[PDB]
Amino acid sequence: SSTGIQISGKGFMPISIIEGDQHIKVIAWLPGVNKEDIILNAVGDTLEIRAKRSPLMITESERIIYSEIPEEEEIYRTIKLPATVKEENASAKFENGVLSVILPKAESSIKKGINIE
Amino acid sequence: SSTGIQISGKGFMPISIIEGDQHIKVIAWLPGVNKEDIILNAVGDTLEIRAKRSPLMITESERIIYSEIPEEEEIYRTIKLPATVKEENASAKFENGVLSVILPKAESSIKKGINIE
Amino acid sequence: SSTGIQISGKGFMPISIIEGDQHIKVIAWLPGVNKEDIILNAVGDTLEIRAKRSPLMITESERIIYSEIPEEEEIYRTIKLPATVKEENASAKFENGVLSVILPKAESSIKKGINIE
Amino acid sequence: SSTGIQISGKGFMPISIIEGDQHIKVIAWLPGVNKEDIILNAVGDTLEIRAKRSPLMITESERIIYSEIPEEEEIYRTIKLPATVKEENASAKFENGVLSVILPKAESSIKKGINIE
Amino acid sequence: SSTGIQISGKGFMPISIIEGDQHIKVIAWLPGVNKEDIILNAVGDTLEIRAKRSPLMITESERIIYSEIPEEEEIYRTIKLPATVKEENASAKFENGVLSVILPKAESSIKKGINIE
Amino acid sequence: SSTGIQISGKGFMPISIIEGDQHIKVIAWLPGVNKEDIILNAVGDTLEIRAKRSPLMITESERIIYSEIPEEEEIYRTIKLPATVKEENASAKFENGVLSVILPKAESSIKKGINIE
Amino acid sequence: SSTGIQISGKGFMPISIIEGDQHIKVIAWLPGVNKEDIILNAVGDTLEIRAKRSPLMITESERIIYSEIPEEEEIYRTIKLPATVKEENASAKFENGVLSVILPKAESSIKKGINIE
Amino acid sequence: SSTGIQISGKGFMPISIIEGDQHIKVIAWLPGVNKEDIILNAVGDTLEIRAKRSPLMITESERIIYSEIPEEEEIYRTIKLPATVKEENASAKFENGVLSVILPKAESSIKKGINIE
Amino acid sequence: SSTGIQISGKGFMPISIIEGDQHIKVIAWLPGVNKEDIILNAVGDTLEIRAKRSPLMITESERIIYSEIPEEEEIYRTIKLPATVKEENASAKFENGVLSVILPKAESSIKKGINIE
Amino acid sequence: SSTGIQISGKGFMPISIIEGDQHIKVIAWLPGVNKEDIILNAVGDTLEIRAKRSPLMITESERIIYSEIPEEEEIYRTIKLPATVKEENASAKFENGVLSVILPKAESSIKKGINIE
Amino acid sequence: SSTGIQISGKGFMPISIIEGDQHIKVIAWLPGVNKEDIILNAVGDTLEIRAKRSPLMITESERIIYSEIPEEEEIYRTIKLPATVKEENASAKFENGVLSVILPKAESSIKKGINIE
Amino acid sequence: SSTGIQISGKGFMPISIIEGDQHIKVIAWLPGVNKEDIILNAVGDTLEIRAKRSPLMITESERIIYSEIPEEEEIYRTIKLPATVKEENASAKFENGVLSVILPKAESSIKKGINIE
Amino acid sequence: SSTGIQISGKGFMPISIIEGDQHIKVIAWLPGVNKEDIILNAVGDTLEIRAKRSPLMITESERIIYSEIPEEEEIYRTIKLPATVKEENASAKFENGVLSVILPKAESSIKKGINIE
């Protein structure tokens, strides 16, 4: 999908991109991932997300009769945001397996209001 | 779909069923959902999963430019297990958006070894 | 169609099935039928509906040019609920051609509550 | 749509882009919009347009028998200009629901003199 | 198209028809039309709409790389209202390319609601 | 066509693009045009060719029975080089209806090699 | 191609056949060829044109990234004129890649008639 | 192909790109080529490689009865790696027909870690 | 492919077969494999080639964004030559990942030139 | 099927061929067969397997409601090995319905080795 | 057809091939041929059969109204046995239009048994 | 092409193979070839033919207007005979571009008497 | 086929036409043709070729297993040359199945020279 942005990565990790006037809020779904094991990195206009969930722990006495859950042990994504961001004050939160990153756009990238009529 | 088990429901909620000799471990993904908002009910060979995730909050100044996350605010599932369970003592955990339910099998439902010659 | 229930019958008889925690609410449309002419038959986990509306009353002086209303005078339907009900204490109300049937479910079928951690 | 330029947005808003030697004239139709409810944001070679019309208000006594006007209440567009413009001296006339934008291009983008020998 | 009324004309001129118990409100989008240029004739149940927008003026030094605005300079529509209107006291308003026409209906068309036994 | 470069234009104007380590050699065919009537423009990484040939001179006494020569009197083309050039010092030669254009590349683009271990 | 006249040859060489009253003017485009390299032969009502353009000279330091110009080093055309020509007085010019043929006289064609007296 | 990177060239030469947090590593297969006959060139985000293998020498008395090895004597590739390079200090190797370039990325691209509060 | 010979094996390993009067020269491409890890075995009219290249060494800190290089860790081929060879005195060379085998053909197999009248 | 070996026979009998430098190990599945009822014959480069499983005995009071086991009572296979074998000292085992044959290859086929420098 | 043997020939001559441990029994149908008119040629692993039956005897007083009997008066067939034969001691019997040919196999091919451990 | 025999080679060289009781006659057409530059080599059951004609020599003043003769300057064939031949006493005649080859077959191929009984 | 000349005839007889300034050289392949059997008729601009090779003689004891040489015993061709020739002094040579004919043109068609320069 190309609608002004490029998306890349590996595994099942749906994402939604929230665009504001002064910042870009990005939300990514990471079910079943531990807290400290995530790693997120962004610079300029580029963002990358890396994670590695543990496989389904199963005792030898048990078996997988039916499991449609994705099996990818390594998943990562990288998206080109439409504008440059300040990779210093950027902050993020991680609840219920959902990653909410807050990227304030660089001042030079911010758009300017145009007088009308 | 019928593969020895019946799966029913509405919305996006992937589930995996682990079958042991004495108990069933049911793994269900509910990313981005609050703990106190899910509800479960089980009896005989039936287990139902009902949940409702919060909507993608949006600020007045911001808008969603790209969001492939399913928007269904209410989702539920109902599955027929291959064996009866003792729901009185069943227990489940929910962390990092992964629902792990353990249902001990009923006495009559448990298999018995057969000697071989 | 197989979605946890069986649907069958004959004739024009649109019905709606509502499942509650402790009861089942069934809405059935019986337009153009008298109150003393309706009939219901329910037992265990099976519900069947029979009906027979009065045919058109038409004066000799007047003629019926166009009537999309189905003329089938004999109709019936049979639906299998997913759970057993206690028909002995069932009750129903019929108003404005709308039949409302409440079938309390059996304690064995009644789904218990399973806590989470 | 990509035909040497990129256009994005949501809703019905036909626009025309004129490329000149020293400026870019962009015409946008915002039929049935209030003047004080349109907003423009542009920087470098990027221009975005937001608008929000009131819905078709209807009196309680009357009912809409036929309306082919699309009902989309929120519409916006974002277009990538092929050349940088000086937003500080940009101007845009808006009359009779017709928006006309004139954007002087940056001197760096301006076409220079090639020897022809 | 036949939906109780016949619609005819030429060009892009989306219209909406609101039918009330005492009057009819007709809304027509006429973007890029001069106020002095619009004229209407309405009688009985018949309304004709004629308009001719000015052509897209382009400077010699500039070119059109992309212009999706309709090039049809002549557009007109005539719709047979289903009810007789009192055009002698009708009025209309035209703002922001939106033509609002208020056509009260002849007293014979007016009907008073009748209850039932 | 996308092969690291963009090609665009209008009319019959076959061109050849040669890339050198320090410069770019562009061959353009302009048959049937005088020397003072050829015109071109370029800047940075963008090259735009405009031309307009003399029409088919014909005497009244003679007639043109067959001419596959294109009659388009106005033609132009625009090609984007993969690297920036220093148009200020560019030079060109035009002989036998063949235009030769040399555009020295900018030092920023001028590639460099590395001693292969 | 056969359309009442026979045209033959090989390679890219657009031509125009002008049927004059006293001469037949034929314009041939031979872009990128030297003057002393073209060769023609004509007799009776037949004209054969042979040419051989220089190949695209390339320096060792430069390479061909893109070239749509025809590379065929040998091109020729041969046409059966509709009228007889006297080659002794034939004349031609080759400038701007334009090879024009005049064939100023066709003795047998001379319609001088006679003094009606 | 566009998947976050651009690949261009001519001939058979499989390449693999390795992405670290501090250096870009590119693996290129050049079987049957001499060490001193390859040439590499890069700048900014662009890397290009030119190479020429010796032809399959054949003795007068012998003939190639079966040869699926590609015969292209000149092959090259040009790829847009995702971040600028410090080629002043870049280095490579070539052994057993495998070309390995190591490209330290520019300070601008050195992705900076963000807190995961 | 069958043209008097049979080819078998596993993995990507293109080969070329040179046929001379007194010997058969076999060229096989083995990019990216060590010297002491190749193995050749021949007898009668049969030749087998076995090899096992190391996988792409990658540190945990780096990734493989794009790698079209074949991943087969074990590759081997076996071809039936058209004639018997003297495997005792055969010799082979290994240059830049290209394996050249020279197999003198058994004197019994050597073909006998016939003369013509 | 021809892939360097020829397989022939009749009935269901899957076979696997293991090739070593000095011996050939042939694995053949003969489930549900008695040991003394199989027959093997081998010479040159040919090996044939003939066997006959007992029928599914059925009691007078019982019937086969579902049996996908192939009913072929006589099955055999004949395969051409890639090398000659010394059948005089060959030996084979048969346990748990798996026939493991070991055929030492003849000295003629014992592939010798060639230097690689 | 390829099933370990080659079949070829011309004309109507149905044949059957039986393989024995020590011999080959070949049944060939030759209807309407005399005993002295048959001919066979066999050597090594190749067997060829030639025949030529008498034409349809017809009297002048009678006519032939329908004959599906093949009219080909010259027929022959050639079949390659999978194993070599000792034609020197071969024998055949021909009765009731059925040719029975027994070809003992050469000791080299006589498949030896192998003990089953 | 396989029709009971194998033919291999390159170029246009029609050949005919006649199989006899005591010999094999092979005819080959080599039009426009010299005698001293054709060569045959045969052994066992294999025959190969090499030939090399001079190209169509043309004077500088003349050009080829039409030539359907294939231009392949190097052509050769290699055919597997169905039976062994005695190359020591083989003979061939080549006249008027027509090559005739007669190869006496070996004693092993010769037919043997069969006892018709 | 029309290529400025009409080609007609029957059978396999490939021919090549070389057009020179002073003469035409025509090469015709006539394999299996006896020198005494060659016959040609040519006049003005028209040439006919007639030939009839000897049939493929086959011995009684031998058979044709495969003979792709053309069986057409009668073949002939007639081509209308585009220029008149002086057939009174023409000459030909026939070597190795190649018919070489030299036909000096008739001065009228010779084109003379066109002295443009």
3-state helix, strand, coil split of chain A in percent (to 5) is 5, 45, 50
Please state, as a whole number, how many other Cβ atoms lie within 10 Å of the Cβ of residue L88: 8
Nearest to J25 by CA among J80, J90, J111, J110: J90
Q: Which stretch of DSSP H or E encloses residue D48?
A: strand D46-52
Please state, as a whole number, how many other Cβ atoms lie within 10 Å of the Cβ of residue C10: 12
CA distances from M84 to G6, M24, M81, M102, M106 (A): 19, 10, 7, 13, 5
d(CA J3, CA M59): 41
Q: Are the Cβ atoms of F114 and H93 closer than 8 angstroms? A: no
Torsion angle, alpha carbons of M59, M60, M65, M66, to 10? 40
**DSSP state for residue D4 in the 8-state scheme:** S
Nearest CA in chain L to I111: L43
Long-range contacts, stretch C64-72, CB < 8 angstroms, 24+ apart: C69/C32, C70/C11, C70/C12, C72/C11, C72/C12
Return the SS3 of B49: strand
H44 and I CB contact within 8 Å: no
d(CA B54, CA L12): 78
Q: How many CA atoms lie within 13 A of E47 on its CB side?
A: 29
d(CA H81, CA H60): 46
Angle at D11 between CA D5 and CA D15, to 5 degrees: 40
The CA distance from K109 to the nearest CA of chain J, in Å, is 7
- Please report, for the domain that includes residue M40, its CATH number: 2.60.40.790
Which two tokens mark K112?
């030896």
In the block, tokens 């189905």 appear at: C70
Q: How many CA atoms lie within 13 A of K27 on its CB side?
A: 7
Q: Are the Cβ atoms of F63 and G18 closer than 8 angstroms? A: yes
M117 and G CB contact within 8 Å: yes
Experimental method: cryo-EM
Q: Which domain holds residue B79?
A: 4-117
| Secondary structure (DSSP) of J64-114 | -S---S---SEEEEEEE-SS-B-GGG-EEEEETTEEEEEEEBPGGG--EE-
Give per-residue burial for E64-80: e unless 16+ CB within 10 Å, then b.
eebeebbeeeebebebe
Say whether the A–H interface has 3 or more Cβ pairs within 8 Å: yes
In the block, tokens 């169905």 appear at: L82
Give per-residue burial for K83-103: e unless 16+ CB within 10 Å, then b.
bbbebeebebebeeeebbbbb
Chain I CB contacts of L43 below 8 Å: 109-112
Nearest to M113 by CA among G48, I10, K73: G48
B66 and A CB contact within 8 Å: yes
Q: Which residues contact M13 (CB under 8 A, 6 or more apart)?
A: M28, M29, M30, M49, M51, M75, M76, M77
Number of H helices, E strands in chain H: 0, 10
Q: Which stretch of DSSP H or E encloses residue F3?
A: none
In E, residues 81-100, which contact D (CB 8 Å cutoff)? 96-98
d(CA H62, CA E86): 104
Which two tokens mark M87?
């057939």
Return the SS3 of A107: helix
**DSSP state for residue E106 in the 8-state scheme:** P
d(CA F72, CA F52): 8
d(CA G31, CA G95): 9
Return the SS3 of G9: strand
Using an 8 Å Cβ cutoff, are M26 and M82 in contact? no
d(CA D29, CA D19): 18
Which two tokens mark E102?
């208020």
In this structure, chain F runs to a length of 117
Q: Are the Cβ atoms of L116 and K8 closer than 8 angstroms? A: no
Using an 8 Å Cβ cutoff, are E15 and D68 in contact? yes
Burial of J53 (0-12, 13-18, 19+ CB in 10 A): buried
Return the SS3 of B31: coil
| Residues linked to residue I85 through DSSP beta bridges, in sequence order | I105
What does the longest C-alpha to C-alpha distance in chain L come to? Answer: 78
**DSSP state for residue D32 in the 8-state scheme:** T
Which two tokens mark I103?
């197999």
Closest residue to L91, CB basis, from I111, I113, I117:
I117
Q: Chain H interface, mutation test: which of F1, F109, F116, most H Cβ atoms within 10 Å?
A: F116
| Residues linked to residue D92 through DSSP beta bridges, in sequence order | D101
Which two tokens mark D59?
């009196």
Q: Are the Cβ atoms of L61 and M96 closer than 8 angstroms? A: no
CA distances from A50 to A34, A64, A74, K26 (A): 12, 27, 8, 74
| Residues linked to residue J47 through DSSP beta bridges, in sequence order | J42, J79
Chain E CB contacts of D23 below 8 Å: 62
**DSSP state for residue D55 in the 8-state scheme:** P
Closest residue to G90, CB basis, from M2, M108, M114:
M114
d(CA B79, CA B63): 38
How far, rounded to the nearest angstrom, does the alpha carbon of residue E38 sit from its chain's CA centroid? 11
Torsion angle, alpha carbons of I83, I85, I90, I96, to 10? 20
Using an 8 Å Cβ cutoff, are A91 and H114 in contact? yes
Which two tokens mark F41?
């423009």
Q: Are the Cβ atoms of K39 and L116 closer than 8 angstroms? A: yes
Nearest to D4 by CA among A5, F78, E61: F78
d(CA C39, CA C56): 20
Which two tokens mark A78?
């990288």
Say whether the B–C interface has 3 or more Cβ pairs within 8 Å: yes
| Residues linked to residue A19 through DSSP beta bridges, in sequence order | A24, B63
Name all chains with 3 or more CB-CB pairs below 8 Å to chain D.
Answer: A, E, F
Using an 8 Å Cβ cutoff, are F114 and H88 in contact? no
Using an 8 Å Cβ cutoff, are I59 and H19 in contact? no
Using an 8 Å Cβ cutoff, are I8 and I69 in contact? no
Residue A68: φ, ψ to 5°: -90, 0
Residue L11, phi-psi category: left (phi > 0), alpha (psi -120 to 50), beta (remainder): left
d(CA E117, CA B39): 50
E27 and D CB contact within 8 Å: yes
Nearest to B45 by CA among B6, B11, B18: B6
Which two tokens mark D98?
């017709």
Chain M CB contacts of G6 below 8 Å: 4
Which two tokens mark F52?
């307009």
Number of independent structural domains in chain H: 1
In this structure, chain G runs to a length of 117
Q: Are the Cβ atoms of B42 and C117 closer than 8 angstroms? A: no
3-state helix, strand, coil split of chain C in percent (to 5) is 5, 45, 55
Burial of B11 (0-12, 13-18, 19+ CB in 10 A): middle
Q: Which residues contact C23 (CB under 8 A, 6 or more apart)?
A: C102, C103, C104, C105
Q: Are the Cβ atoms of D114 and F8 closer than 8 angstroms? A: no
d(CA C100, CA C19): 13
Return the SS3 of I36: coil
Say whether the F–A interface has 3 or more Cβ pairs within 8 Å: no
Return the SS3 of H115: coil
d(CA B24, CA B79): 13
H34 and F CB contact within 8 Å: no
Q: What is the dihedral sign for C-alpha F59, F65, F68, F70?
A: positive
Secondary structure of J3-37 as H, E, C letters: CCCEEEEECCCCEEEEECCCEEEEEEECCCCCHHH
d(CA H111, CA H22): 8
H107 and A CB contact within 8 Å: no
Nearest to B21 by CA among B115, B116, B113, B117: B113
Nearest to H70 by CA among M21, I27, F50: I27
Resolution in A: 4.2
User: What are the helix (H) ranges across B26-97?
Assistant: none
Q: Are the Cβ atoms of D78 and A4 closer than 8 angstroms? A: yes
Nearest to I11 by CA among I25, I35, I36, I28: I28
d(CA C40, CA C103): 12
